[PDB]
Design a protein around this nucleic acid. Sequence first.
RNA 1: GCUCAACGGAUAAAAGGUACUCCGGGGAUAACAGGCUGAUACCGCCCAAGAGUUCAUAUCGACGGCGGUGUUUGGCACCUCGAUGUCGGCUCAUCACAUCCUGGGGCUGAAGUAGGUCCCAAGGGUAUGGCUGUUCGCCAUUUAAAGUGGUACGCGAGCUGGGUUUAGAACGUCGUGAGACAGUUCGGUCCCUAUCUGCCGUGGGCGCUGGAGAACUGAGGGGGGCUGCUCCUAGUACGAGAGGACCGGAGUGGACGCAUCACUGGUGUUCGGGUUGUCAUGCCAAUGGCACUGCCCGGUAGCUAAAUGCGGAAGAGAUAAGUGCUGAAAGCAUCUAAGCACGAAACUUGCCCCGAGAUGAGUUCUCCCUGACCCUUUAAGGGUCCUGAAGGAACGUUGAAGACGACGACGUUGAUAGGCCGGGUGUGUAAGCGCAGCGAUGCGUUGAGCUAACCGGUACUAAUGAACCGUGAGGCUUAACCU
RNA 2: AAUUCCUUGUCGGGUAAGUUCCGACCUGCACGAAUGGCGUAAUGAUGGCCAGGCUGUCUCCACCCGAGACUCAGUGAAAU
RNA 3: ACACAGGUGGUCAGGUAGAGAAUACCAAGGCGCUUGAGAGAACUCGGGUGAAGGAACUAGGCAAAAUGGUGCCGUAACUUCGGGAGAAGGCACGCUGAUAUGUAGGUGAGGUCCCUCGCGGAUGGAGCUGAAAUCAGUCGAAGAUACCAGCUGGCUGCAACU
RNA 4: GCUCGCCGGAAGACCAAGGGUUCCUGUCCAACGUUAAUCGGGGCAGGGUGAGUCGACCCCUAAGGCGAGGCCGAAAGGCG
RNA 5: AGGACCGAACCGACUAAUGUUGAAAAAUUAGCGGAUGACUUGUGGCUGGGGGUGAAAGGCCAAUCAAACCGGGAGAUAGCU
Lengths: 120, 122, 56
Amino acid sequence: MRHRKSGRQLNRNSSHRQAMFRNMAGSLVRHEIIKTTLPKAKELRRVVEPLITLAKTDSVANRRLAFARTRDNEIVAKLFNELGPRFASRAGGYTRILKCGFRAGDNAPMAYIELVDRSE
Amino acid sequence: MIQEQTMLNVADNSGARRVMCIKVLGGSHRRYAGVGDIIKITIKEAIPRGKVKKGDVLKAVVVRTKKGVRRPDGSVIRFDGNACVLLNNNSEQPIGTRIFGPVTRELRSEKFMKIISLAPEV
Amino acid sequence: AVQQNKPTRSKRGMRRSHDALTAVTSLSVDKTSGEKHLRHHITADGYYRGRKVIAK
RNA sequence: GCUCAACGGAUAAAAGGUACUCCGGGGAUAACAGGCUGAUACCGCCCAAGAGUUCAUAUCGACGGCGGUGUUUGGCACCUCGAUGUCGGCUCAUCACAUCCUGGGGCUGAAGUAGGUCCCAAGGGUAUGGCUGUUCGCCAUUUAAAGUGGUACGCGAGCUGGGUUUAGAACGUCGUGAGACAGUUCGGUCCCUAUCUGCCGUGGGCGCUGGAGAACUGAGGGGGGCUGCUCCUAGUACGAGAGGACCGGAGUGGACGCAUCACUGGUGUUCGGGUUGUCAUGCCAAUGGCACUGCCCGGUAGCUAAAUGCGGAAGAGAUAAGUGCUGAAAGCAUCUAAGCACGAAACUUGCCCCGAGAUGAGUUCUCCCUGACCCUUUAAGGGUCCUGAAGGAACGUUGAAGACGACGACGUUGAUAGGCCGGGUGUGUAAGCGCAGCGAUGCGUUGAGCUAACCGGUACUAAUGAACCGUGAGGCUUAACCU
RNA sequence: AAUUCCUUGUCGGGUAAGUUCCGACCUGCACGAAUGGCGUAAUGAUGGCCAGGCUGUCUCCACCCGAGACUCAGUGAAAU
RNA sequence: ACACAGGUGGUCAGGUAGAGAAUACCAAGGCGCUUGAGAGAACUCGGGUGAAGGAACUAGGCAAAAUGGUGCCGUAACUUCGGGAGAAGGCACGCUGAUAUGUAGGUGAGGUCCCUCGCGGAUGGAGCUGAAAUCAGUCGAAGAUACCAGCUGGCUGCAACU
RNA sequence: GCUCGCCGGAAGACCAAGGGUUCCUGUCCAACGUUAAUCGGGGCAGGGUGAGUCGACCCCUAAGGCGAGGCCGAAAGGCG
RNA sequence: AGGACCGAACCGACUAAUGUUGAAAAAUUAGCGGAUGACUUGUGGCUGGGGGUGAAAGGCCAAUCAAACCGGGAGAUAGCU
């Protein structure tokens, strides 16, 4: 079992975890810091870093992508203009994780995920 | 892979498309047969030009496998059918005058070269 | 095939002896402020490892 | 005067059946199992009418006798009827030895090869196909064997549920008949919240005593144990010959057992591409979601067997049966008594793995610590301050390490996990632009475009000072040395 | 034989073999004409015996996915 | 007994695809739960993948997988002549062109016509709508592309069939 | 608030039986919804149910029940 | 035309599996099947204890039934426990 599978199966079916982490990517770029469980904060890093890398090139052929799973009306001008110089041009390491403590009244570990650069 | 209760085509001349594998032999418990090694067969159809009877119990040897001949380098030489040839139980030797098979190196590793060599195919 | 006679209250004390929860003492403090945290999370004041992480 | 004769007589008046029932009582009473016994059963010994062309006793035995066994077929009615699942089928154990095979060899109507028979021995081994409820039986082919027995003739808080042993049906028979039947078939349930003893992995204490760290002893346990095929010695021994062996000298196989993923297959729902229905980005292109991963077609890394590599060692010690030396009891004789020597697949090591709770608590090396005060009064006990080494714990990043714990890598004295860069394996030449062809479609730019695990490169993201636990040379003695 | 012990009668066919299957036979211990007799097709929630495709039923499973086994928090049993 | 995987009367069912009330994306409409967090081992339950072999498994192909659409072809024994039969066994299927640049099927102006006037009547065929099918050529592993969607043959006890 | 997902002959819309204050705003959080609860068909108040024509009634009456005068029966009860 | 071939709504029990201290007083998941009839069904009636109802199992008769359920004779009787 799992002898090269390094993917976390986490909790609930894959199709939930897909929908949820594709929605959370839109939620993260909107407010640039989001709070959730420590497992969810780490599982949001998967395929979203390749999606940030995908937003670097401003060519009309690359402008065809980053559009299949996460859409929003207020990223349409930042895409292929800002996400490069702000994040993707760093070449890896686009995020930060930090545990903030435990969840209210229960033993769940809580964390915040942020982008590696803040707007000035 | 060839085993007990397998139906095969036969490499013996004027042999029918249907002969039954009743034992895989070797004395010890055995799963499957092996190339160049013996197997026990019964004739399920007889052709009047042939030299065998339906329902008769005979000795055979495996001469082509879909598994191919592959021991020395792992490089396989493969065939599109599973077949054996018939042997006499007292006088020895292939009972036919022609063989329909590739007559590979492990068949010339037996006492049979004189009656198999009319057409080498590899 | 059922429990017959009650198990000993010393055995109940020994099976309960295997506890591992700690009294968290001492708690860690930040390199610029004497405010308490567990050894890898943020303070409830926005201070952490002498870096300062949440503004007011 | 009532064969009321069921006679000591239950009423001018009373017969059968229940497996369709059913009630009180029970191993007091049977069945499937536990005990007792061993006539019965199988075997040996004393003994011997005879067979064995001779000869009773190699081998076999009528007669009579005396045992070996627990062990069956029966006897028997103790403990069991407030309820021990029975036969067969599957799946899987433990002990005997009365040995089928495997090692040993004796006697012989044993030259030799064999056959017949005998007993030291249970360490290893002891198929498969068809018919039946099925054992029991029969048949075909395999085998070093196709051993016997105990364990409720071993494994239903095991799997199966065809027979027997449920309600209903259906045939043959007996009876006046309900019923009955050494007459028989079709459909017919198999329960279980694991407490305790046990078993199999794994944490945490107490201990060897001043505290820590690295590693290794071996009192003892486990694992292992057989075997098929072929060839040399050798056509050697024995024997005209026919025929044909021990002795030791190698190679090669299976069940079965182990390991790795390199080959060959498989799978591989973090992935490349085609496609039918449709929705979505205005619409078209391009592109994505859904329809079982829609349908798939495929597959890296990984894992796996059906793939490949390997496997039950060599050696040493000591024995039993058995063969002997030297020899007294028995002036001879004698494997035994004193004293010496050999021997089996057994027995014990060696092999392989565990292993000091081996409380009988093993052993070396390395690291560290050289502080005072008070009370009862004392070689005992309690308290106070000062501030602490060696080491551990905490925390990450996460693992080739996991259910929880335990354990690995390392943490900027940074490649621990990821992203990014250069490339692999694997897919398949797209998009955009134009061209040929009513067009499907094909062509060039193009080995296009696409990427995760594999390989190499890179601090781009992330990985606390160190708190806390731990303190101050650590009780007595036998013997020697240093002071 | 929905009727038959020994019986898998006894013979033939199918089969490496076949108490099953198919077909005969008579010697039915005991079928028999309305407590009916005998036969015929589509057909049968019917039973027995074979052939072919297809196939993880099986050689023998090996790896996945969705849900339980685990663990922590909240609320916290029963039979005995 | 419960805010319980259950039971329960009448009326309604658009688009795209499709014969369709099957079936999917959808429409209008609705809901995202009266325990949550996580994880992940022997094992438990269902689904997915299936090499080479295949009914050997089993009491039994049970269960499971394959077949599956309909126009044109081609069909045994037996039979109550109906049936058996979709027997058995075969071809074709996208797209475009060419068949019929769209046939069959349904519908159809004015004029000719008959009158009674007139929501005229009736005769007809310009027009409209529109299957299912064929052949060539090129493309794929695959065109009834998904969901949807018949295993085939033989012996036989017994029972009419529904 | 933005975004995602699933059902879409239902996981939608309307009507009825049967139930019964459930509707709405205004608050409350002891107990209840085997939790969190700020929510609530829960606690506790306050507001809300406007009809000539809608469903019932109207008028007739099937199955059936009742049943005079009359009959059967101690009678409960029953026939017609 | 049809006690006709397949088949929605409608019906429904046969195999298999899950469930079995359950969601559960009998369901769930998949399939095969009944669907102009000797059928099915909405609504209200009628059939009762040795009586009903049954193309008939002593099955069904509100979970019960070789004789239902409740209340009484009844604290019946037990050479027994």
